[PDB]
């Protein structure tokens, strides 16, 4: 069951690269992409990804983070 | 063993959202045996490692690919479904 | 690819090492997106701006495992 998760993150390229590396390091992730006109959203695609743990980790290490999409 | 792109499974690809969607699928063979496959643009060019060599591969408007491939190797293209 | 962005594809020896390679590439300045692709899911495709592919190869080799540049477009 292939998943797509879109997360909006507070990026206050420091926070962006840090956010991207964190997500990319997560188990089950096949792809990560920085999107939005403000380049403040990350699209993650993979299998077996836990979005709750991912949000918790972004909030702890990068900044506030919100789930926009899970499909 | 012959090549038949109408029966090849689609590549494992990712349409990066920050760039236009590429119009073509490419398939690389050695002795007519599939080695890998991916996406590429039409009416464009890329440098690709094909066996031992770096090969400059040009694509036309119909996803036909041309290049100087090493002996035994070929890269062939076709249009993706919506293109 | 057409436009301002670069696409590069790197094969990495990955057997832990998968997440490490992805994280390294994703942390690189100028990166917009990174994906694991290919028939053997052993190739990383990177899109962005101002990325030096040869420096990326050297960094992957130092930190992760062998790495080979396979496409620039």
Residue numbers in the entry:
A (entry chain A): 187 to 198, 200 to 258
B (entry chain C): 31 to 113
C (entry chain B): 184 to 198, 201 to 258
Give the authors' words.
However, following a co-expression strategy with 6xHis tagged Pikp-HMA and untagged AVR-PikD (see ‘Materials and methods’), we obtained crystals of this complex in multiple conditions. The structure of the Pikp-HMA/AVR-PikD complex reveals an intimate interface formed between these proteins that buries 18.7% of the effector's solvent accessible surface area (1031.0 Å2). The majority of the interaction is formed with a monomer of Pikp-HMA, with 87.5% of the effector's buried surface area (902.2 Å2) and nine residues contributing hydrogen bond and/or salt bridge interactions. This suggests that the AVR-PikD/Pikp-HMA monomer interaction most likely represents the biologically significant interface. Three primary sites of interaction are apparent between Pikp-HMA and AVR-PikD. The first is dominated by main-chain hydrogen bonding between the C-terminal β-stand of Pikp-HMA and β3 of AVR-PikD, which results in formation of a continuous antiparallel β-sheet comprising the four β-strands of Pikp-HMA and β3–5 of AVR-PikD. The second involves the side chain of Pikp-HMAAsp224, which forms a salt–bridge interaction with the side chain of AVR-PikDArg64, and is also held in place by a hydrogen bond of its main chain NH group to the side chain of AVR-PikDAsp66. AVR-PikDHis46 is bound in a pocket on Pikp-HMA via hydrogen bonds/salt bridge interactions between AVR-PikDHis46:Nδ1/Pikp-HMASer218:Oγ and AVR-PikDHis46:Nε2/Pikp-HMAGlu230:Oε1; also, Pikp-HMAVal232 packs on top of the AVR-PikDHis46 ring and contributes hydrophobic/van der Waals interactions.
NLRs are a conserved component of plants' innate immune systems and survey the host environment for perturbations caused by invading pathogens. Intriguingly, the NLR pair Pik-1/Pik-2, which recognises AVR-Pik, also binds the effector via an HMA domain but this domain is integrated between the CC and NB-ARC regions of Pik-1. The integrated HMA domains of RGA5 and Pik-1 appear to have evolved from a family of rice proteins that only contain the HMA domain. Each of the Pikp-HMA monomers adopts the HMA-domain fold (Pfam: PF00403), comprising a four-stranded antiparallel β-sheet and two α-helices packed in an α/β sandwich.
